[PDB]
Amino acid sequence: RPDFCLEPPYTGPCKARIIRYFYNAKAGLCQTFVYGGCRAKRNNFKSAEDCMRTCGGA
């Protein structure tokens, strides 16, 4: 859970059915979420393994 693991989930102003994966620093584990489509943040990934192997790590 390096730097890109503190900013909380950000869906953004847009509301496109873009379901993606993010890092839940509130519990210390990755989880799924809904991305509006625009104005995303670092806490953004495409797979549960992606978030866990990159932000999670431990």
Give the 3-state DSSP-derived string for 2-31, with helices as H, strands as E and coil as C.
CCCCCCCCCCCCCCCCEEEEEEECCCCEEE
Which residues face 30 on adjacent strands?
23
Q: Number of structural domains, the chain?
A: 1
46: three-class secondary structure by DSSP: coil
Name every residue whose Cβ is closer than 8 Å to that of residue 29 and which is 6 or more positions away in sequence. Answer: 52, 56
- Residue 13: Cβ-neighbour burial (10 angstroms; 0-12, 13-18, 19+): exposed
Sign of CA dihedral 26, 9, 3, 5: positive
Residue position matching structure tokens 């890109």: 4
Measuring CA to CA, which residue among 39, 6, 37 is closest to residue 19?
37
Measuring CA to CA, which residue among 13, 12, 2, 7 is closest to residue 40?
12
| Tally of residues, the chain | 58
CATH number at residue 55: 4.10.410.10
- The structure's method of determination equals NMR
Q: What is the domain range of residue 25?
A: 1-58
Residue position matching structure tokens 């496109």: 16
